Design a protein around this ligand. Structure first.
Ligand SMILES: NC(=O)C1=CN([C@@H]2O[C@H](COP(=O)(O)OP(=O)(O)OC[C@H]3O[C@@H](n4cnc5c(N)ncnc54)[C@H](O)[C@@H]3O)[C@@H](O)[C@H]2O)C=CC1
Ligand SMILES: NC(=O)C1=CN([C@@H]2O[C@H](COP(=O)(O)OP(=O)(O)OC[C@H]3O[C@@H](n4cnc5c(N)ncnc54)[C@H](O)[C@@H]3O)[C@@H](O)[C@H]2O)C=CC1
Ligand SMILES: [Zn+2]
Ligand SMILES: [Zn+2]
Lengths: 428, 402
């Protein structure tokens, strides 16, 4: 019953990014800080200090009024509070296996996280604090935050205030590849980043990919998304407002509506252009192109079919304006973050960032990105009695005589007056 | 700290391009051109039973035991990532689901000089994770099927589908879901470089020993020798505070190598020479630093105060704490190449709010959005405020004009 009442009237890289990064990294590897400063001057026209001091942080944010600060403080605490809860959800343990064998999981934060904040125009303050706040909540002891200098004065003061309030340990006025590489190689700080996070342009993305591989492109990149699942009980005016909400980001921001209600679909399709029409010019232009080219509406038969299509689309941000929200929570399986019910909405902000599904399911920005699970094992002598035998035999069946001797040596040492079937030794 | 001792992928684009277009046909085509395979790819309960009747009860009991040492750990590790609900700001509920992925592909090289553990580690781990479908591939052996040891392991580990199939054909089959109609959400298993770039496009061995003066240099030597015999590119490191032990070990390794059988003797000679390393350190604190920088896939710890090392070491694949256990007894997991239950599990986060909560959250959002010049965002807050609090007048920020 899947019917595209409105369809994607467009489709979603370059080697250009690769060239620059490779050349730029090669150079920064060679020259270090001097190359970084040079790129800063050539690219950003910047000649100031790189590492901010407590005083310059305090000075450059002194015109941010108490009311703006209080709001950012509030938004940041939300992220922190979810992040602390999420950290407690990954436990350490030990377990007895074969008698005399103990095995376990240690859980520890990485030492150093680098956070980049694009601090351009059409970017949320949230981008500055989400990485930093999450890393600190994870228990990462050192967080380096970078953002390109805004208009010659330094870091955009909101971004800078957000860095400080979120708990960044070191702040640096650097943009682009040279920021990513400095954080990665530990320039200016002497603490190489175990991971680097944060959105940016193709160059920042490519820099992360090159330096970190899979843990550098596993967080949601590209333009802002929004998906809404809605049945007959949903309110079309709200639904349409929520799509238009993320569509003002730019001309490539996808806004999807999956619904089991033709009536809703029709009303939303009608309401959206009216709402766009009443935006201020910048947003009006952004949203028109955004909805025109990338807006989709999918009428489905049953709930199950909505689950299928939503899981396929795997929206970074997914609202559920339906009855029986418990069902939808229990059945949906691929999305970035879920907004259950009408009350919450995407613009209230994420608690985590979802994976880069446009490449698939794995990664994202949460405390889990900043934590290592290490496994260990330990045995009594007694336990080896059984395990040594098995390993010797299996080893000699694999043709691994050296492996077997590791068991033989232990069997000999731990059980001197004992006979054991340790397999037939390898003669080839 | 002082160093004593020191040290195509284009057929993938085409083969995939051909499998994408032609599907199952291309896989059976590629099967005879690279392996000469005639029969169907998908085995059946009978073929699996027939082909594993040659394996004795004592061998099976060994493999079964070894799988239980993996499975039982994996089961515990699965429960270590919890689902939860939490209240933040009053009336804000938020939480985390933990879901197995749907289908995992496992690939085992049926070759010799490989561990049987290769075949069961992925399969068993995926099953303990709660994954409902595990597809398992392994390259045939001279038109005679999969090595019965690999096949028995697959089955005993709890594979749902077993497919005799190799290389890029295997990976792509599993990844597109040819023969089963079930695309794997992830594929795992060692293989050749074709296998590797096949994994890269769609989606050596090691050992280290930390030891102090209380270590038994014979055992330390033997353990280094144990994994050396894999190949000429298997590193075998020693980090120690004891020059004495450092020497006796460097002395006794060659004597153990020399006493090995033919293939293993020369395998270890190259490796221990080319890649073997030794590092003497003044303090424990120093050894931690160096171990962490190397991050061995397998790391043994033969010292006093094993707790301290458990507490302070922070980078490795698998830790073997104390003398008694040893690399050869097997991993519970694989470090980064890592393989664990966590690899096969999604977290999904969600939030829900009362109307009361949006009183404060909505007006903060409207003010921030409008500083960011995001008028439409702010209007999602406005609309909620008008619907839930009809006569309210909160500071929702100055509307954007630009
Ligand atoms: N709408 C969303 O969902 C958001 C996404 N993002 C993304 O962040 C992006 C921001 O990009 P920008 O404004 O450029 O900020 P940015 O901070 O990511 O990049 C600026 C830096 O890029 C460097 N750079 C620019 N062109 C270069 C070139 N040709 N070679 C080398 N270095 C170069 C500059 O020197 C500067 O240091 C947006 O395009 C957006 O896609 C960020 C915020 C929100
Ligand atoms: N210590 C480690 O890191 C371990 C990794 N390994 C690796 O497993 C591999 C074992 O190699 P094999 O036993 O041969 O198994 P393999 O993984 O190389 O698979 C063999 C299959 O490759 C395919 N193939 C052969 N020639 C091809 C070609 N020209 N183009 C495309 N596909 C082709 C065929 O289907 C054949 O059945 C080695 O690379 C070894 O290093 C072994 C297990 C442990
Ligand atoms: Zn937004
Ligand atoms: Zn081995």
């Amino acid at each position: 019953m899947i019917s595209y009442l409105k369809k994607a009237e467009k489709t979603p890289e370059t080697a250009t990014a690769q060239k620059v990064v490779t050349e730029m990294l090669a150079e920064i590897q060679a020259r270090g800080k001097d190359a970084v400063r040079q790129y800063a001057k050539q690219l950003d026209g910047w000649s100031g200090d790189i590492v901010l001091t407590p005083d310059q942080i305090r000075e450059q944010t002194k015109d941010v009024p108490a009311g703006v600060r209080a709001d950012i403080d509030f938004a940041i605490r939300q992220v922190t509070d979810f992040a602390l809860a999420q950290r407690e959800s990954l436990k350490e343990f030990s377990v007895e296996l074969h008698p005399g064998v103990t095995a376990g999981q240690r859980v520890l934060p990485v030492n150093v996280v680098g956070c980049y904040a694009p601090a351009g125009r059409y970017a949320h303050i949230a981008s500055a604090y989400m990485g930093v706040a999450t890393a600190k909540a994870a228990g990462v002891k050192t967080v380096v935050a970078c953002s390109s200098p805004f208009r010659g004065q330094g870091i955009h003061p909101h971004v800078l205030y957000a860095f400080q309030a979120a708990g960044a340990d070191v702040i640096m006025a650097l943009g682009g590849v040279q920021a990513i590489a400095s954080m990665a190689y530990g320039l200016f700080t002497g603490k190489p980043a175990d991971v680097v996070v944060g959105p940016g342009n193709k160059f920042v993305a490519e820099a992360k990919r090159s330096l970190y591989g899979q843990v550098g492109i596993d967080v949601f990149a590209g333009p802002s998304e929004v998906a809404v699942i809605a049945d007959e009980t949903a309110d079309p005016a709200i639904v349409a407002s929520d799509l238009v909400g993320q569509a003002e980001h730019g001309h490539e921001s996808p806004a999807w509506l999956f619904t089991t209600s033709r009536d809703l679909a029709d009303r939303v399709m009608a309401l959206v252009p009216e709402l766009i029409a009443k935006l201020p010019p910048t947003a009006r232009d952004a949203a028109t192109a955004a909805w025109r080219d990338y807006g989709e509406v999918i009428l489905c038969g049953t709930r199950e079919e909505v689950v299928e299509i939503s899981d396929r689309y795997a929206s970074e941000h997914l609202e559920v304006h339906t009855a029986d929200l418990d069902w939808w929570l229990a059945n949906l399986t691929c999305y970035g973050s879920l907004f259950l019910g009408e009350e919450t909405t995407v613009a209230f902000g994420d608690k985590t960032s979802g994976p880069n599904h446009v490449l698939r399911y794995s990664g994202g920005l949460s405390v889990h990105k900043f934590m290592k699970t290490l496994t260990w094992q330990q045995m009594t002598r007694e336990a080896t009695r059984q395990i040594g035998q098995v390993t010797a035999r299996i080893s000699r069946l694999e043709g691994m005589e050296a492996h077997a001797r590791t068991a033989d040596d232990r069997m000999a040492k731990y059980f001197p007056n004992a006979s054991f079937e340790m397999g037939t030794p390898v003669e080839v």
